[PDB]
Amino acid sequence: EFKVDDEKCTKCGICGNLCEAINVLHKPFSPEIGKVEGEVIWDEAYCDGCNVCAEACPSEAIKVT
Amino acid sequence: STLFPKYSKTTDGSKVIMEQRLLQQVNNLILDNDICTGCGICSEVCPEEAISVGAVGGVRRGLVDDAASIHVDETKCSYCGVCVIMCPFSALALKVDGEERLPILEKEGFPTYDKGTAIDQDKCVRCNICDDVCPRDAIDRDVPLFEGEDKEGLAKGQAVELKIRTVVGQKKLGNVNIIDEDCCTCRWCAINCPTEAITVNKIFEGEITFHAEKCPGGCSTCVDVCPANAIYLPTPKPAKDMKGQIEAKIAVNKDFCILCGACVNACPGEDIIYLRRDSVKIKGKETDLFKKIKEKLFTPRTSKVKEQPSLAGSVELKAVS
Amino acid sequence: KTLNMITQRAVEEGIAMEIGKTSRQYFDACSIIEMNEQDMKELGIMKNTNVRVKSESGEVVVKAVVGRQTCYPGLCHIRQGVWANQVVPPRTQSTGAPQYSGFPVTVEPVPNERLKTALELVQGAVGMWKG
Amino acid sequence: PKVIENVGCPYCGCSCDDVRITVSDDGKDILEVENVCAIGTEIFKHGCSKDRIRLPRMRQPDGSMKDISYEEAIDWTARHLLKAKKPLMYGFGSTNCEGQAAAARVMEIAGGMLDNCATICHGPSFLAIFDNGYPSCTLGEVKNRADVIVYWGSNPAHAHPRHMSRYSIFPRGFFTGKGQKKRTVIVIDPRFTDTANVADYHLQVKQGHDYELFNAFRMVIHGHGKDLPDEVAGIKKETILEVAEIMKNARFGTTFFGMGLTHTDGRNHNIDIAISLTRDLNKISKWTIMAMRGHYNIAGPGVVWSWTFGFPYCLDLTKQNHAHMNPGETSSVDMAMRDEVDMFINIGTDAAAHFPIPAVKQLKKHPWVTIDPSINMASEISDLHIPVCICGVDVGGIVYRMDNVPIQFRKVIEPPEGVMDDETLLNKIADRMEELKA
Amino acid sequence: AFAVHVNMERCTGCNNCVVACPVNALELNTVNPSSTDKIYKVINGDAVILDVKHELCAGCGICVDACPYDVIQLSGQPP
């Protein structure tokens, strides 16, 4: 079902702030990289076919089914 | 003698309050020791040479109790308020009677820093990155809190303007700003904003260099005290990847360094760090005093071991030619 | 009340033994209970007062203090030595290592009773206490 | 004012050899001692004393204690060792490795039980080593490579004071040039010890539940760590996962253990579950268990009797041509409990103080001999007290560090005129026993 | 140029204040060492501060944070 495109994701919380399934962990910010980088974790136990977060993402980084 | 010029220096909790009593007129230079960062841009700028810098690393780490980052001789201070205008992270305030009052600005006798902050609300998307990466607590994002971490601000389905189908255009629920008296112009939020909607310009310009080969290892005081977290300990490589290059001991990110000076004031080394500012960015016209202050801020500096004993209790740096 | 107990080290204790096992330094360093403040309040033990530590394999009168090394509620501690080994149970579990840490014990506030010196403890356990 | 470098501190497992002594002009008074901890400072200050034991001392009928000559004491001990039926020689924690070889020879001649402080200290650990193995390392290895350090059930700040500043945490090695700041230190014990103060984590575990803690860690490592209960041994599952992730990502780890594991429920099974954990971690990282040995040369009896009889401790030398070892049956405390001895010889330890008092009561039924440099509890309830030189102060030799690395200790003071050392003493006892033709 | 005070009564000689001081670590652990003077050295079992005239300390707090049983008080105010 769910699939993110880490190629086009900026790790903006506006995708994990909506659903209770999407929890976005920003691993600690270090000037090493100087960038934001984390992971998007989706759990089945909370989803729906709502698909709101597909278009809530600023980018098109989320396709769900 | 005479008593009524009562000079007092009280440490009321976390605020060091420096005062000058009269019958009805007071003068309160109040330093908020939770926000000071140990830079000396308050000691370099003091027209009357009263503010000195103390145990920056210890105080900024919490291991010192009987002192603040800075000591102000309130008998010498003149309550001009130049330190309050020229402190990049506003951790110094002047209260004349009982109110934060700056006569020199009221008369326009001194320029102020142009941090120039702004967030084009027609481009910001209520993301959470700018509040997350901000080294200081200076992003005031006013957004209703949806099902993420709380009860719905409106509803998961009302976070997107949906007609219940297709989305109608754009959502942008709420409003995000930058507390302009707290931003230090690090640019972590502009460099990492997803939609390039943040406009901040560094107050200082110049260059800082790190001679990694002179850091004595386990001294991450510079890392601990950097306000804009520009400094890092370069992560040791794994095996089968070292490739004969061992590692650096310390380095900096010039994209985020704001040329404050806390690193130089804190390093116990000899000349690991080289700091030199070239141009401060201001609004307000100028003054002969401001030209003197520019000349004072723009002299290159570096650490020093074994400074003179007669000034024990404070910091003295090296003048670089 | 059941008040589980352990027996461990301390630098002052090591210092004391190398001053000498029969020295006032050793007495002061080892004759010590280091228990929790909550347990001291609940039992009724005045800080810095003798107390009767009585396990199933002995008994000893030991000063009762509070230790920096924060014992969680329900733990005791004697710095190892004469006094602790007056009360350590000898069970080895067929390994030769007596139950030096983790034996139950009951604690009874008994001030106005002296502490027994190291020589007095050992030479009286054996039956040699001339003095 | 004759500064002497590279001396050895003869107290804790660290066997520190970076000690500088400023001996007096006449070579018999120690003035200032540099670079050593306090426990050590006091050892040297006691060794350089002016009023110290010089001759043996016997128990007369009246109960007092009067001196005798060395030859008379050797005769007494030899005759008693031969007349006995199963004498027990205990100690050897604080002696040179020649002192632990001479003793092996003496009790080979006699036929008794030979044993050391391993039984009551880290012998439960050896019993686990026998079960699972000992993936270990020298201390310079953790000085120069360690990225994670675990102090499981140990307290270096009070047990081994300069352990942290010499081998584990603070030194800036070769691949650890950044020093402490890239070392993750985890300390596990129910107390909030000074090691936990210095540490960066702390897993305050219920005393006695370390087996459940190790099993939790190892299920996490083996991969299906989701099957853990909500909390284990008082430790919370998320903290367990945190520490386990750090351990997995460690470039080169190292685990130290002590009385928290060797003196609680399941004496040796705690240690062998720890060793199993180390062997499991070496699947994805490099991890090395290591035991916090106590006395300087307490690993000396282990190696010396390993090369001599093949058994580190609990030696059954009564068959006179084949030895046996079973800690539950041949150990000093169990034999003292079951009154299975006939004579106790105190050599390099303080049995009276540091044994359980029921065992001391059971032992004192028989004759009791003490070979110590100074007065202690055993020398106060013994029958005769033979003086002997102090290792590292009056006499030099080899000692064995925590990690079985031989340090060479030096001599700084000549021992008082008349006092001999244990290797000369044990050799004279063996010669006299052979003279008595047994 | 601050002032450090060591409570000799509870100092154990652990030497983790000597090893951890970044001014002590300048001699052997730096490329082309600048200054080779040392704040602490453990003489007779307790840490002695050779920095009598308070010229080399930098108020880092690495030594206060290092001592296992807090015994080093750092003074951030002029002596």
Ligand SMILES: Nc1nc2c(c(=O)[nH]1)N[C@H]1C(S)=C(S)[C@@H](COP(=O)(O)OP(=O)(O)OC[C@H]3O[C@@H](n4cnc5c(=O)[nH]c(N)nc54)[C@H](O)[C@@H]3O)O[C@H]1N2
């Ligand atoms: N000053 C001094 N130094 C010494 C000694 C001395 O007597 N005095 N003895 C020396 C010798 S003989 C020894 S063997 C070494 C050994 O000394 P160590 O092996 O380092 O052990 P301890 O100092 O006794 O402290 C053991 C720690 O384990 C904790 N503990 C107790 N029970 C448990 C438990 O169930 N689980 C866990 N995880 N922890 C527990 C204890 O609270 C304690 O914090 O020290 C040596 N150094």
Ligand SMILES: Nc1nc2c(c(=O)[nH]1)N[C@H]1C(S)=C(S)[C@@H](COP(=O)(O)OP(=O)(O)OC[C@H]3O[C@@H](n4cnc5c(=O)[nH]c(N)nc54)[C@H](O)[C@@H]3O)O[C@H]1N2
């Ligand atoms: N309550 C409690 N009791 C315990 C423990 C516990 O955890 N809790 N742990 C037990 C364990 S771990 C052991 S190690 C014991 C440790 O306790 P011990 O092994 O008895 O250690 P010490 O008492 O310090 O013994 C030092 C004596 O040897 C003398 N000596 C020094 N050098 C020499 C030498 O070269 N030759 C000879 N012949 N003598 C020398 C010293 O002067 C001194 O008399 O404590 C044990 N008792």
Ligand code: SF4
């Ligand atoms: S899915 Fe969209 S909103 Fe969520 S983290 Fe990725 S880019 Fe940001």
Ligand code: SF4
């Ligand atoms: S599809 Fe709907 S329910 Fe599922 S994760 Fe996205 S927003 Fe949440």
Ligand code: SF4
């Ligand atoms: S200029 Fe720097 S040191 Fe001075 S008050 Fe502001 S933040 Fe603190």
Ligand code: SF4
């Ligand atoms: S108010 Fe003026 S004189 Fe007083 S400390 Fe600040 S800059 Fe110096």
Ligand code: SF4
């Ligand atoms: S990072 Fe940019 S887009 Fe995101 S909330 Fe801040 S200003 Fe808006």
Ligand code: SF4
């Ligand atoms: S420039 Fe730095 S301090 Fe200012 S708002 Fe952005 S991240 Fe925060």
Ligand code: SF4
């Ligand atoms: S790196 Fe830049 S911001 Fe950080 S302490 Fe140094 S000069 Fe200040």
Ligand code: SF4
């Ligand atoms: S630059 Fe200064 S603070 Fe940073 S490691 Fe080197 S000496 Fe320590």
Ligand code: SF4
């Ligand atoms: S740690 Fe042990 S060996 Fe090292 S100096 Fe201290 S007492 Fe001596």
Ligand code: SF4
């Ligand atoms: S504060 Fe820093 S420089 Fe000063 S003595 Fe301590 S570790 Fe050394």
Ligand code: SF4
């Ligand atoms: S670290 Fe603390 S205990 Fe150790 S020598 Fe220094 S002051 Fe003494």
Ligand SMILES: [Mo]
């Ligand atoms: Mo031991």
